[PDB]
A paper describes a structure:
Recently, a shortened Dscam (sDscam) gene family with tandemly arrayed 5′ cassettes in Chelicerata species has been identified, which encodes ∼50–100 isoforms. Chelicerata sDscams could be classified into two subfamilies, sDscamα and sDscamβ, containing one and two variable Ig domains, respectively.
We found that FNIII2 alone but not FNIII1 or FNIII3 could promote cKIT tyrosine phosphorylation, suggesting the essential role of FNIII2 domain in mediating sDscam cis interactions. The gel-filtration analysis supported our observations in the crystal structures: Ig1 mediated the formation of trans homodimer and all the three FNIII domains were involved in the cis interactions.
Author numbering: 387 to 491
Amino acid sequence: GASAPIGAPTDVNVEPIGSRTLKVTWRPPLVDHWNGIIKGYYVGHKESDSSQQYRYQRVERSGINPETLLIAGLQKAKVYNVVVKAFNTAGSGPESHPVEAYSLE
C-alpha cells in the first residue's frame, strides 16, 4: 500500500550563527526515493552526549531549495547534532546521518 519515502534528505549542513542559534539547510531525498509526493520534513536535534531521543520540529515543504530552518533558544556552550527526514502523506522516511555544531554566542 501507501508508504513513506525510502531515502533520506541530502546535503544536510548545520552552521552556528551566534546567539545560541543554528542554521540548518538540506535538500530533498533522491527523486527516486520519494515514493510519492514530499509534503514536508521533520528536523530533529539533541545534545551530542545525551541518550535522550531526538527532539523534532515539523516543517512544510517550501518552493525553495535548499530548505532552511533556524533552531534558536539553545543552551550555552553545548554541542548538538541535527537529523532530517522527509514525509509524504503516508509517513516519514529514514533520517540523514547527524551533522554536528556548537551552540555559539
